[PDB]
């Protein structure tokens, strides 16, 4: 269906290329699975020689880590704020790797810092994903603190 | 070719199997095992060609199913079992024991040994690291794992396997001035005294005081000293005289 071969592309000089064999099963691809937000759902895959893969169609209640106090706690996922490569994913609410989100601060026990205090009055905090959702099958990430919060907030919608 | 190969051809067979390149077309492709592809031979050729105990395929099953064949102290009934380097095979009947290493002309030989040598076995360490729950381990060439050994045994030193309790008993370290045995390369079956150890090769001395250089992976030290001699040597002792002296013994030496 979808191949990853290299025999079809042009040469370094720009001349055309010619094929001599059919499509092999060794280089075999799949379509994109866009992980949405909703009620949870996980389907299984079969890879080469056993080795089962997990893909997540609709994800909820991802895990996150507090960097200062060094504890890990679960939270809900509300909205997406920024996506690096394509800016259309923010209106469709798809979660991929390295895309910042907005999480509930209910179970989280935060320390007293100047920056997080004003958002902690409301329910929301910020986090950034660090795991492949479509292949591992679950999201994990870090909570934004310090100058890392200064970098992303210049890129927000405003 | 979408998968593995299962048929082997007699012309690409190794010449060290001493087969005839006559009327046959196919040869036995042996099983996967602990030894490499070069140092292994099938078992069904040993009972037919080198040892002479059977004539055809029927008499092979008779000796094997009677459970007298004992390789490394274990009974085996499969004809495709690979016999490697250095292992001791024996028959339970008649108390016959053999050690397997190469001759002088790159061929397999079988040398009758004693029951005091029939117990143990020699191998060479290749790798060592500490496994789970803080337990040390030492890995040999054939793939056996061994734990809780002496800390004076290094990565390249040889061991002595008891073969019945499967415990490391004795070891010989790696240094200069040791007797050595080689098993691969263009020079096989040479027995030599170490003179200089380089980082990748070893500069050695034959019993006929010659010289040859050989990589470190292809050798196995059998004794630290000449007086040690942990195993029994072959009859030629691996001297492998040159073609000049083979031309000298036929017609006499050139008088000058």
């Amino acid at each position: 269906g979808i191949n990853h071969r290299g025999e079809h592309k042009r040469k370094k000089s720009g001349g055309k290329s010619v094929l001599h064999r059919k499509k092999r099963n060794n280089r075999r691809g799949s379509q994109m699975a866009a992980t949405k937000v909703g009620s949870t759902k996980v389907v299984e895959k079969r890879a080469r020689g056993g080795n089962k893969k997990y893909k997540a169609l609709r994800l909820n209640e991802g895990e996150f880590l507090y960097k200062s106090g060094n504890i890990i706690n679960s939270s809900k996922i509300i909205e997406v704020m920024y996506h690096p490569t394509n800016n259309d994913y923010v209106r469709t609410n798809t979660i991929t790797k390295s895309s910042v989100v907005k999480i509930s601060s209910e179970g989280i026990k935060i320390q007293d810092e100047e920056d997080l205090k004003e958002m902690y009055e409301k329910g929301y905090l910020y986090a950034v994903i660090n795991s492949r959702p479509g292949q591992v099958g679950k999201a994990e990430g870090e909570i934004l603190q310090g100058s890392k919060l200064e970098f992303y907030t210049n890129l927000f919608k405003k | 070719t979408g998968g593995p190969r299962k048929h082997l051809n007699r012309k690409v067979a190794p010449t060290s199997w001493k087969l005839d390149k006559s009327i046959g077309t196919y040869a036995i492709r042996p099983h996967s095992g602990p030894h490499k592809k070069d140092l292994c031979i099938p078992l069904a050729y040993v009972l037919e060609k080198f040892l002479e105990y059977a004539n055809n395929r029927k008499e092979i099953q008779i000796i094997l199913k009677s459970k007298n064949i004992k390789i490394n102290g274990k009974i085996i009934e499969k004809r495709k079992y690979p016999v490697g380097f250095g292992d001791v095979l024996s028959i339970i009947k008649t108390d016959e024991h053999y050690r397997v290493f190469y001759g002088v002309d790159k061929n397999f030989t079988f040398i009758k040994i004693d029951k005091e040598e029939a117990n143990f076995k020699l191998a060479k360490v290749t790798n060592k690291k500490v496994m789970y729950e803080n337990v040390p381990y030492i890995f040999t060439n054939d793939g056996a794992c061994f734990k809780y050994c002496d800390p004076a045994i290094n990565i390249n030193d040889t061991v002595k396997i008891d073969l019945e309790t499967r415990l490391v008993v004795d070891y010989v370290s790696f240094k200069e001035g040791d007797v050595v045995f080689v098993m691969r390369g263009e020079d096989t079956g040479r027995v030599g005294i170490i003179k200089k150890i380089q980082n990748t090769t070893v500069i050695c001395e034959d019993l006929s005081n010659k010289e040859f250089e050989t990589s470190i992976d292809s050798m196995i030290v059998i004794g630290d000293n000449e007086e040690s001699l942990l195993i029994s040597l072959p009859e030629e002792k691996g001297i492998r005289l040159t073609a000049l002296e083979e031309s000298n013994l036929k017609f006499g030496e050139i008088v000058e």
Binding site: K9, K67, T85, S98, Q145, G146, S147, F151 | -
Partner: protein
């Protein structure tokens, strides 16, 4: 943190983690420098600088394995790519003479060497795994263009 390289993601290195409220010198002493093969030193600009590159072998991920070749630079127009020209000689058995052949190899340039390397001087490279469609090696060291015969004044003596 540095604006020498335009970013779309937070510029940190892999595996090097610390407290978020961190000073400039505390960030500076935690930069991980890779280890190299013999005969090669890490440059001075690999340590004091603040850039983060995925493909530079000093403070990076790519490990160089294999042979080492040489050449002369040809072009420096694009970003982090240079074209190295390699000359050699082939032997013809019938006429018993030699011919001259040439190749072009595009290699990856680290951001350490910026104003030094010009057009017309040697570069010592090293082959790695594949990095692009046409990019497979990495610049390691350079020498200046030789000055054998040129006009020298008395102050040049």
């Amino acid at each position: 943190i540095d604006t020498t390289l335009k970013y779309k993601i937070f510029p940190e290195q892999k595996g090097v983690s610390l407290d978020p409220y961190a000073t400039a010198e505390e960030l500076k002493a935690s930069r991980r420098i890779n280890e190299m093969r013999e005969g090669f030193t890490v440059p001075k600009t690999a340590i004091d600088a603040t850039y983060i590159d995925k493909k530079c072998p000093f403070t990076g991920d790519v490990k160089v394995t294999g042979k080492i070749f040489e050449g002369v630079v040809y072009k420096m127009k694009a970003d982090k790519t240079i074209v190295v020209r390699i000359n050699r000689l082939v032997y013809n058995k019938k006429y018993r003479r030699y011919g001259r052949r040439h190749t072009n190899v595009s290699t990856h340039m680290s951001p350490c060497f910026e104003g030094l390397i010009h057009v017309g001087d040697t570069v010592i490279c090293g082959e790695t795994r594949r990095l692009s469609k046409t990019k497979s090696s990495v610049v390691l060291d350079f020498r200046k263009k030789s000055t054998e015969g040129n006009f020298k004044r008395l102050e040049d003596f």
